[PDB]
Amino acid sequence: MREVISIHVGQAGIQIGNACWELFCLEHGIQPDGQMPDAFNTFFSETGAGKHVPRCVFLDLEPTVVDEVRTGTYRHLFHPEQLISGKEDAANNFARGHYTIGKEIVDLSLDRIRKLADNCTGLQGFLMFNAVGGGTGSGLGCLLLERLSVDYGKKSKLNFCSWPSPQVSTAVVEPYNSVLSTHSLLEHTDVAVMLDNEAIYDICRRNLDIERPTYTNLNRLIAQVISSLTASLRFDGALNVDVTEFQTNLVPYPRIHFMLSSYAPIISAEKAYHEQLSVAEITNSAFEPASMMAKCDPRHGKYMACCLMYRGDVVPKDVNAAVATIKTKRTIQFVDWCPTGFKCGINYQPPTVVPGGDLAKVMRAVCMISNSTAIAEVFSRMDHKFDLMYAKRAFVHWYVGEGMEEGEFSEAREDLAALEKDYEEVGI
């Protein structure tokens, strides 16, 4: 009846897909098997006698990261065809993942997608998780969004882009991948949320005081965001916020759909039993630049619009008493044509703690999503790192020789340059 389809593409999408589905299953009380022995309907199906199969697809061109999903604990939970695999990777290459290797895996993708999305109409949309820096994450990621746009027009296509960090990249061909994707992520994606990697790394190193996180500690924190995102979709709410609600509220014009994130509180068990997590306390920490999930200081930008989702024992009254304080604060400021700039959400069911995790069992929480002018720096930084490389044609022979043509970089450059001209024009 009421559905939203998850699409995971690439390395990053699969790994963060794993941690997402662990929490979704755990808080809905379904086993490794899939039988809990109608609030779940948005995420899971009904397959006979009390058996729930998730409404997701895993895409990767290499088998070795989807092998380990088919091999571990949740192998009886995912339908076998809902994990689609090739035999060879895309190898950090946009060109490979789009034109060469990508064409014969999207036909299997759209078959599984269509059968998993036609059972009921009133589909909210598609969550998409991709690594922009990656090969199949970027290359294939454009292509299945291209064909989705032709088929299902009217319908939300959200994205959670794992964006290159300002200082740590661990890939040298990655400025080419990021610029080429951003051009086509502009045309056929409704909402883009940036999850920078080392933004979350130092958040852990300050708040949780964890010296040795891995990707899985990163995946649990992203999983808590998606849960707080769609809590109103699944559960009872005092003022519920859906996914169609966002696009109208955070996107002033077509080109501008790049938003940041901040979740608070995140404190360990050793400093949570000291803290009275009042609504004022958690909303102050949400707007702090050290808690943003992009490593991009909003002090050199203006908040064009902002969205706040509360979760727990949260009264509507203390929200208004705590958002009015943010409006009067002088360090944070709003664009002139946005006098009012807030969307609020209160959901009842408190955040679910994963055992053996590193968060703490807490009474209330905030997830904040904001559209800013400070986004001008994150493409102006790629502006530099792309003209450094492309000047003397570094790595260009790879892309040309496997199907692309020269001048797709020039077209990607013009659209990125026009995007910077666009954000600077809004901020005036």
Binding site: K87, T170, R212, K385, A394
Partner: protein, 426 residues
């Protein structure tokens, strides 16, 4: 799934390649007899990459032995882990190339090539889907350098899109046995700059410096030297065989480390490396690895990288470790030594994490650097080439087999322009 076809050329390639199969077999728990011991999934889950079932329980490697004289592969058969190889994968020669690159390439390579290439056709195509090849050879020798490279030329034409990496051991700087060294080395490079994809250079004198100055072995035999080269080979292919937090195949390495298609000559180090005396005293950690790794003492070539610029580097880590510690050290290295990294590219390094370490070590790292300090390698071959090509010393051997004098001049220019290319980015 994916398989790597292994091809071993020359006396060096057999003695080096014996130990490579000894370390992979130990890593995957394979008996000298051929069977398996150790009841864990991790080994056999990705065993197709190297091995092949025989339906007697037992495995055969995807290996193609190759030499022009029957002696050197008699020794590898008589040894332990010598029963492992299928005896049809050997290809024999009776004549042999006497350190003469010409008659290795043109005359006595041309009648054995139809036999060895038949073995490759049968074995490579024989899987579901091939990932590529790897060749191990010396560029100082005759059948490692002359006939080894002709195999690469023909396999590359038949299989254009497959990866093709090599572990070539170059001429030494200091002492030069097999006096026709720069003729073999120079003529090999121009054939190996066009028809090869990734090249990892090793010097013998770099290996002997590591032994005598760090490992402190009294009598380092070819068993001990080949143990270390094998540990480098296993490092660059961990991802193919075990899972990890950040996967990295062979093609993934190349597209990062190769900015322009001409320049693909790489350097190799391996950490950790300490004597058996100081094994228990040394604290093993990610910062301790990354500073052992970034050292000319540790490097497996006789070219000091501080004379040049790391154009692009990479580290393939193995072991249970935190990403953030990996991320800080790769950033710490670029922040303090800002003059040893080329400027018009930020963050010159790639990180990779494989979960399963080598057996006995809890954490390790192998290292790949694309430098313009390898210019000083080719110059020291270029002057040595033109020193004896001036006098036309030992040319009748080469020119009596079928070559013209024009090929020598092309090999000069095709190596000097590569020298000039490393100048351009410095």
């Amino acid at each position: 799934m994916r398989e790597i076809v292994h091809v071993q050329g020359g006396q060096c390639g057999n003695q080096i390649g014996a130990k490579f199969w000894e370390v992979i077999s130990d890593e995957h728990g394979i008996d000298p007899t051929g069977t398996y011991c150790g009841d864990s999934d991790l080994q056999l889950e990705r065993i197709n990459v190297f091995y092949n079932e025989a339906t007697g329980g037992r495995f055969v490697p995807r290996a193609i032995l190759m030499d022009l004289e029957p002696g050197t592969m008699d020794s590898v058969r008589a040894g332990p882990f010598g029963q492992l190889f299928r005896p049809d994968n050997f290809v024999f020669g009776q004549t042999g190339a006497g350190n003469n690159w010409a008659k290795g390439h043109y005359t006595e390579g041309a009648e054995l090539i139809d036999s060895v290439l038949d073995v490759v056709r049968k074995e490579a195509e024989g899987c579901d889907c091939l990932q590529g090849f790897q060749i191990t050879h010396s560029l100082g020798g005759g059948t490692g350098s002359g006939m080894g490279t002709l195999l690469i030329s023909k396999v590359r034409e038949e299989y254009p899109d497959r990866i093709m990496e090599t572990f070539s051991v170059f001429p030494s700087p200091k002492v030069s046995d097999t006096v026709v060294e720069p003729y073999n080395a120079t003529l090999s490079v121009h054939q190996l700059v066009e028809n090869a994809d990734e090249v990892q250079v090793i010097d013998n004198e770099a290996l002997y410096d590591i032994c005598f100055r760090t490992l402190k072995l009294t009598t380092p035999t070819y068993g001990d030297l080949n143990h270390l080269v094998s540990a480098a080979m296993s490092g660059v292919t961990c991802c193919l065989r075990f899972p990890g937090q950040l996967n990295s195949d062979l093609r993934k390495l190349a597209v990062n480390l190769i900015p322009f298609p001409r320049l693909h000559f790489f350097l190799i180090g391996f950490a950790p490396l300490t004597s058996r005396g100081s094994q228990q005293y040394r604290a093993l950690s990610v910062p301790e690895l990354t500073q052992q790794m970034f050292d000319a003492k540790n490097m497996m070539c006789a070219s000091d990288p501080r004379h040049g610029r790391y154009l692009t580097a990479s580290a393939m880590f193995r072991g249970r470790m935190s990403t953030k510690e990996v991320d800080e050290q790769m950033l710490n290295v670029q922040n303090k030594n800002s003059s040893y990294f080329v400027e018009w590219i930020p963050n010159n390094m790639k990180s990779s994490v494989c979960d399963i370490p080598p057996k006995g070590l809890k954490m390790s790292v192998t290292f790949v650097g694309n430098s313009t300090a390898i210019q000083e390698m080719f110059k020291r071959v270029s002057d040595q080439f033109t020193a004896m090509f001036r006098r036309k010393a030992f040319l009748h051997w080469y020119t009596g087999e079928g070559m013209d004098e024009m090929e020598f001049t092309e090999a000069e220019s095709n190596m000097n322009d590569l020298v000039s290319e490393y100048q351009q980015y410095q």
